[PDB]
């Protein structure tokens, strides 16, 4: 005999799409980028609750972390055929729970429409 010398483990990935997220600044009336990276829909294996988790490329810092609530409604944006905008009542990307008016843009209109389908799929799962 010779002797020898992130908090996502519990979740299933339903949808994985590449996107850019914006937050609306009400005060100075304009849109501001919050991050660009993989947007992910994560179903918890314990609670069967689906969330959006989005991380920025390279630094991997969280720019979105909230439940896909059944109350939310994806509305279009006047300047885009590949974006949805919606009110979120509690996001914890920055740490402290806070409300936002988000927008989320994609590579194509087909990606955006698929996102909307998956977003509504996930909403139905969260009704239980």
């Amino acid at each position: 005999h010779f002797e020898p010398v992130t908090m996502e483990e519990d979740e299933e990935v339903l949808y994985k799409v590449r996107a850019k997220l914006f937050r609306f600044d009400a005060d100075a009336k304009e849109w501001k980028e919050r991050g660009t990276g993989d947007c992910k829909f994560l179903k918890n294996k314990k609670t069967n609750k689906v969330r959006i988790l989005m991380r920025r490329d390279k630094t991997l810092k969280i720019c979105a972390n909230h439940i896909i609530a059944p109350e939310y409604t994806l509305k279009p944006n006047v300047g885009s055929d590949r974006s949805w905008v919606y009110a979120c009542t509690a996001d914890i990307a920055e740490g402290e729970a806070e409300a936002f008016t988000f927008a989320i843009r994609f590579g194509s209109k087909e990606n955006a429409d698929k996102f909307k389908e998956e977003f509504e799929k996930a909403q139905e799962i969260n009704k239980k």
Binding site: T6, M7, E8, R18, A19, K20, F22, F24, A26, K29, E30, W31, K32, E33, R34, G35, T36, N44, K49, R51, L53, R55, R56, D57, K58, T59, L60, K61, I62, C63, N65, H66, I67, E71, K75, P76, N77, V78, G79, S80, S83, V85, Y86, A87, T89, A90, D91, I92, A97, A99, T101, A103, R105, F106, G107
Partner: protein, 210 residues
């Protein structure tokens, strides 16, 4: 955290110092040039495999008339970034001057030289012209605060030198499970107001790939 390092960020006015820092703080891209007056300090945390590392970023003024305390800002700095603009020959010509004033106060610190705005097609300061870093032992990166080309590299390099581990990597910060907040009608009035205004303000840069 309490593992914290002071970083001075210097270079000519309009090179993109403040834009670069804001990108790292909030993720936004500021299109407007609003000149920094003297200095703004911004705490900036990265999550690494050797625990979190905080930079106290002293974003200084590049315009002569808004210089403020000038080299006063460099005292007890433990690292720095010198910034220029590859679309502007004069911002690279002034790099030796920013370095001179920086090292006279900070004799032995890691320093990164950054050529910003490499997204712009008509590049004026060519790659082969950029050699000032060699005899002064500065790390050099082409960067773009707009496209995020190499935007993490200056902070990753300084992190490695300050902690004294060349295998240090940025890693994914812990994603806590988000809350289950029920909305009340007392805050739905302002959410509905903000939402109607948000939909009718066009998102910026719609020709971009994302």
């Amino acid at each position: 955290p309490q593992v914290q390092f002071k970083l001075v960020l210097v270079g000519d006015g309009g090179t993109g110092k403040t834009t670069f820092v804001k990108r790292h703080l909030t993720g936004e891209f500021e299109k407007k040039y609003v000149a920094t007056l003297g200095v703004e300090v911004h705490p900036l945390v990265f999550h690494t495999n050797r625990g979190p590392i905080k930079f106290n970023v002293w974003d200084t003024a590049g315009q002569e008339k808004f210089g403020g305390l000038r080299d006063g800002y460099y005292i007890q700095a433990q690292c720095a970034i010198i910034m220029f603009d590859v679309t502007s020959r004069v911002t690279y010509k002034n790099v030796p001057n920013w370095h001179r004033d920086l090292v006279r106060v900070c004799e032995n610190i890691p320093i990164v030289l950054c050529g910003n705005k490499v997204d712009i097609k008509d590049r004026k300061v060519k790659a082969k012209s950029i050699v000032f870093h060699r005899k002064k032992n500065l790390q050099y990166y082409d960067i773009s605060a707009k496209s995020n080309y190499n935007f993490e590299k200056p902070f990753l390099w300084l992190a490695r030198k300050l902690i004294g581990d060349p295998n240090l990597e940025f890693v994914a910060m812990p994603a806590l499970a988000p809350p289950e907040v029920v909305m009340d009608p007392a805050l739905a009035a302002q959410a509905e107001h903000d939402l109607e205004v948000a939909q009718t303000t066009a998102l910026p840069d719609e020709d971009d790939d994302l």
